[PDB]
């Protein structure tokens, strides 16, 4: 039993049979190498299946790989199954046809479950580090030369500069002088205890100034910190804007959008507020680390142009 003492991946279940179209077979070592399996949280299934789909072959869902309607991934009572829906994914083998022009080991690979390595058209054993980047993907910005092991960042002094009376800190514990602090944290002391993985509960009230105090460990490479933290964006940033005033400002800890997930959400959430940008105060030691700005919350209709965010990005992280 690969799923022995663990009570929250549901979603690690759910992707067994759409796995399996690929030949894969994933142990519990295996399993271990995803974040969320070996804390045990709540999870999409999908974000985990586009993480899966680029460490063993070197490509994203947007290559269409998994693009067969074979197997549904569902969500009933906020539990993922693979129960009927319009939701449903596994391999297409029209699309490895394509493929195999310039990946020749790329249909060895999906028949028997192997890592196709990019850099070598050759097929290992599963391992997180051989491919870091989905090399179909275009990203959006630039991405950090060197990650180093910093302390954590202290967003006190930002955050107490910020207009605003009333705030609301998510994640980890924050002081902020001058303002009135509620605290959402799965901790004994918090304002509102919860288990973050399940997101802002639709009991927490409005505030003027949300904060996001949530990071995310970086392993292999900038993309997978950023892919980890995807659902962490959708479970509290995105959940966020529901518990804004007019006008209100979300601020969130984040690592830009390097994967396809944190892009969509990053413009679904951009796109409710008048303002929306990204900076790295001095405070933010951690290269891959950035606070998204969010000013202005409102209801209006409102395009998004992601090349705003997207060239501030390549800035931080180039030194440019």
Same mark, same amino acid.
Not at 43 to 55: D, F, G, K, T
Not at 187 to 215: H, Q, S
Not at 257 to 271: C, F, K, N, Q, T
Not at 301 to 306: D, E, K, V, W, Y
């Given at each position: 039993?690969?799923?022995?003492?663990?009570?929250? $991946?549901?979603?690690?279940?759910?992707?067994?049979?759409?796995?399996? %179209?690929? *030949?894969?077979?994933? %142990?519990? =070592?295996?399993?271990?190498? $995803?974040?969320?399996? =070996? %804390?045990?949280?709540?999870?999409?299934?999908?974000?985990?299946?586009?993480?899966?789909?680029?460490?063993?072959? #070197?490509?994203?869902?947007?290559? #269409?790989?998994?693009?067969?309607?074979? @197997?549904?991934?569902?969500?009933?009572?906020?539990?993922?199954?693979?129960?009927?829906?319009?939701?449903?994914?596994?391999?297409?083998?029209? @699309? $490895?046809?394509?493929?195999?022009?310039?990946?020749?080991?790329?249909?060895?690979?999906?028949?028997? *479950?192997?890592?196709?390595?990019?850099?070598? *058209?050759?097929?290992?054993?599963?391992?997180?580090?051989?491919?870091?980047?989905?090399?179909?993907?275009?990203?959006?910005?630039a991405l950090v030369l060197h990650?180093? =092991?910093?302390?954590?960042?202290?967003?006190?002094?930002?955050?107490?500069?910020?207009?605003?009376?009333?705030?609301?800190?998510?994640?980890?514990?924050?002081?902020?002088?001058?303002?009135?602090? /509620?605290?959402?944290? /799965?901790?004994?002391?918090?304002?509102?205890?919860?288990?973050?993985?399940? #997101?802002?509960? #639709?009991?927490?009230?409005?505030?003027?100034?949300?904060?996001?105090?949530? !990071?995310?460990?970086?392993?292999?490479?900038?993309?997978?910190?950023?892919?980890?933290?995807?659902? +962490?964006?959708?479970?509290?940033? +995105?959940?966020?804007?529901?518990?804004?005033?007019?006008?209100?400002?979300? $601020?969130?800890?984040?690592?830009?959008?390097? /994967? !396809?997930?944190? =892009?969509?959400?990053?413009?679904?959430?951009?796109?409710?507020?008048?303002?929306?940008?990204?900076?790295k105060?001095?405070?933010?030691?951690?290269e891959?680390?950035?606070?998204?700005?969010?000013?202005?919350?409102?209801? +209006?209709?409102?395009?998004?142009?992601?090349?705003?965010?997207?060239?501030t990005l390549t800035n931080i992280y180039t030194g440019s």
């Open positions: 039993d690969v799923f022995q003492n663990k009570a929250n $991946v549901c979603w690690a279940k759910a992707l067994v049979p759409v796995l399996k %179209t690929a *030949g894969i077979d994933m %142990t519990t =070592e295996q399993w271990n190498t $995803v974040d969320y399996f =070996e %804390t045990d949280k709540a999870h999409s299934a999908e974000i985990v299946l586009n993480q899966l789909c680029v460490r063993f072959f #070197g490509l994203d869902l947007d290559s #269409g790989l998994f693009s067969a309607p074979t @197997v549904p991934l569902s969500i009933r009572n906020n539990h993922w199954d693979n129960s009927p829906s319009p939701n449903m994914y596994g391999l297409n083998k029209e @699309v $490895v046809r394509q493929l195999s022009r310039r990946y020749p080991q790329l249909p060895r690979a999906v028949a028997t *479950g192997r890592v196709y390595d990019m850099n070598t *058209g050759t097929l290992r054993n599963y391992d997180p580090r051989i491919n870091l980047v989905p090399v179909n993907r275009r990203l959006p910005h990650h180093n =092991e910093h302390p954590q960042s202290d967003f006190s002094s930002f955050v107490s500069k910020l207009k605003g009376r009333t705030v609301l800190v998510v994640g980890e514990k924050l002081s902020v002088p001058g303002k009135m602090v /509620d605290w959402l944290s /799965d901790r004994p002391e918090a304002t509102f205890r919860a288990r973050l993985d399940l #997101g802002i509960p #639709g009991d927490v009230p409005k505030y003027d100034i949300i904060f996001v105090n949530v !990071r995310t460990p970086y392993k292999y490479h900038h993309y997978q910190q950023c892919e980890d933290h995807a659902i +962490k964006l959708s479970m509290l940033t +995105k959940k966020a804007c529901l518990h804004l005033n007019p006008g209100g400002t979300c $601020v969130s800890i984040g690592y830009g959008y390097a /994967d !396809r997930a944190s =892009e969509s959400i990053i413009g679904a959430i951009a796109r409710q507020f008048k303002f929306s940008r990204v900076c105060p001095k405070s933010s030691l951690e891959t680390e950035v606070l998204f700005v969010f000013i202005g919350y409102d209801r +209006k209709a409102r395009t998004h142009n992601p090349y705003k965010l997207s060239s």
